[PDB]
């Protein structure tokens, strides 16, 4: 679990998205695994907008965060599971380091903020939904 607080916006994966975030929905995007949604309170994170390859993650099943080396965002097969059918989800990073379902939401950041959030993982990889090119979080 976890989330992305940026202005008035919530940013979740969007398989894990509550009847709240649905009912206060401003964009979706099942091919990128994102949902965000409307909040009254003002947030307190700050995205990156930049091409680094290189941050930390959190990761909840270990209580740790790692660093890691991100490929650049891109269209990456993933099984099919509860939520999805086998698709190709977009704007994905894969990285080596732990992950397990439970560690989606955790956030990945570099030196200038908030990259993106784990979505996928496999056998020692570990997958992050960017949201860089998300300029309209900003204003
Ligand atoms: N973005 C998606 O389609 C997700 C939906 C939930 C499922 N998903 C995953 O990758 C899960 C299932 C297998 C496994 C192993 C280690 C870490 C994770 Br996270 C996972 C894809
Ligand atoms: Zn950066």
Same mark, same amino acid.
């Given at each position: 679990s976890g989330a992305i607080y940026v202005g008035n916006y919530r940013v979740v994966n969007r398989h894990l998205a509550t009847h709240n975030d649905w009912a206060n929905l401003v964009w979706e &995007?099942?091919?990128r695994d994102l949902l965000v949604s409307s909040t009254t309170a003002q947030g307190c994170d700050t995205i990156a907008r930049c091409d680094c390859q290189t941050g930390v993650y959190y990761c909840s099943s270990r209580r740790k965060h790692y660093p #890691?080396?991100?490929?650049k965002p891109?269209?990456?097969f #993933?099984?099919?599971?509860?939520y999805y059918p086998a698709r190709y989800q977009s704007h994905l990073m894969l990285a #080596?380091?732990?992950?397990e379902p439970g560690d989606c939401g955790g956030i990945l950041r570099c030196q200038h903020g908030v990259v993106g959030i784990v979505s996928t993982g496999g056998?020692?990889?570990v997958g992050f939904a960017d949201?860089? &090119?998300?300029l309209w979080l900003d204003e």
């Open positions: &995007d099942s091919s #890691v080396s991100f490929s891109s269209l990456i #993933v099984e099919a599971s509860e #080596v380091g732990h992950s056998n020692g990889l949201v860089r &090119d998300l």
